[PDB]
């Protein structure tokens, strides 16, 4: 049931000082701690993607590189997760992260992913409710080796930031939700990303893709929608982080300027 629905345009913007995360799980208070890790560099070129479905294949798969900074100002129901892997078909393993209103499912199988994958919602007349289907995300999922169900991390103007790293067997996800007063989507200032999950995956990830949710029309089978998101790439960089009295990273310097 793989259908091509999403077209995507891209512009380039400034990261400013976004993308800082807690590099370990150690409480530090009122110190300057210098750490060398995969960080999003300050004032780096970040790609702003606008993905539009109106009611051909123009939604390519992005590289993963050394890790991905992801940001979105959209609501929690439009962008519903991500796809990670190398070939994104049945010959290699892949990682699927899907959020819905109640929980998140993170699941590593041999998915035969569609070229334009999207979670579609549709009303079911026997269940008498709007259900969600992954049959437009993949056509099959076999030899499935990991599953993790937990509370969702796309919940409810609100800027949602994620950092994905794939380091020595573990898929590390860091996240932060920041209420941004109406203005520039990527704001100034600092908001450190707290460690959200470390997943013992142990797969090869070189490419990634964002999952959108599309609604059936009931009035060109799907309702027209738009999703804007920012992608930046992590680099091995040395940062000097300021930990204040309560253990919060309130400041950092990127050591190239």
């Amino acid at each position: 049931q793989c259908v091509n629905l999403i077209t995507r345009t891209q512009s380039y913007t400034n990261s400013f000082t976004r993308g800082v995360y807690y590099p370990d799980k150690v409480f530090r208070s009122s110190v300057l701690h210098s750490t060398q890790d995969l960080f999003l560099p300050f004032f780096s070129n970040v790609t702003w993607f606008h993905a539009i479905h109106v009611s051909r294949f123009d939604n390519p798969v992005l590289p993963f590189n050394d890790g991905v900074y992801f940001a979105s100002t959209e609501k929690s129901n439009i962008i519903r997760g991500w796809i990670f892997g190398t070939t994104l078909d049945s010959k290699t393993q892949s990682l699927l992260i899907v959020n819905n209103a109640t929980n998140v499912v993170i699941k590593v199988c041999e998915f035969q992913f569609c070229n334009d994958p999207f979670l579609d919602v549709y009303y079911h007349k026997n269940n008498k409710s709007w259900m969600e289907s992954e049959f437009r995300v993949y056509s099959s999922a076999n030899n499935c080796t990991f599953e993790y169900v937990s509370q969702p991390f796309l919940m409810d103007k609100n800027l949602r930031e994620f950092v994905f790293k794939n380091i020595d067997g573990y898929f590390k996800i860091y996240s932060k939700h920041t209420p941004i007063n109406l203005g520039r989507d990527l704001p100034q200032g600092f908001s450190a990303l707290e460690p959200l999950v470390d997943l013992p995956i142990g797969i090869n990830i070189t490419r990634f893709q964002t999952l959108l949710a599309l609604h059936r029309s009931y009035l060109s089978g799907w309702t027209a929608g738009a999703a804007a998101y920012y992608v930046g790439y992590l680099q091995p960089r040395t940062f000097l982080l300021k930990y204040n009295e309560n253990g919060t990273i309130t400041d950092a310097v990127d050591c190239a300027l």
Partner: antibody
Amino acid sequence: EVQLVESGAEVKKPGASVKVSCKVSGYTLTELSMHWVRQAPGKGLEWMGGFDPEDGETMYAQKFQGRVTMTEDTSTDTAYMELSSLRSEDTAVYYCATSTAVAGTPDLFDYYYGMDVWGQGTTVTVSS
Amino acid sequence: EIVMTQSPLSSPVTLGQPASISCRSSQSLVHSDGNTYLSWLQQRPGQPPRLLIYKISNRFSGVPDRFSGSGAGTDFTLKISRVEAEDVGVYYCTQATQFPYTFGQGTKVDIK
């Protein structure tokens, strides 16, 4: 847009089942209320029965209860209709009609009732 | 069971002149959802009926702007602003509120 295609016309001696099919496309069969309407020649077209989006699933006409059964195959997206005990008055053109079960967004949706998209008719004739 | 009455049975209309078809229900078609469900269907000889108008006056997709619906409660009308050579055939009004769904006896519109 929903597109409906039909099965073939048939003739059968009375006392055996009739298999009238309707294949949907564009929308799958679980998003659609499905109805079946009979038209005898020289008479107005009358409703045999169909889906109820609330307070039950399937309703039948009072003059077709005990004969008509309608089955839905989600895998092939086909609405089948069967009726036993054919009579000589049953020589008629059979229409499969359909509608969306709801209308609106997932946040705001309401139940819809009616017969919007009609397929081609299948002529069921009962003779010797 | 809701019985429908059509009026008049056959209406000879010249080309382009407006034609009015009355649909009447012996029971009020107000549904608990708030909407009232009456639809106006057109049938040509050798062709299945197609939905002209759903929900009193809303136009279905692909329907020209010469078909209008009006009325409420128990009194409904279909008004055709221009009659052309493609408008010959039998017109029906149907309800969808109370089961069983019923249909009118049909009105035949011709040219001469």
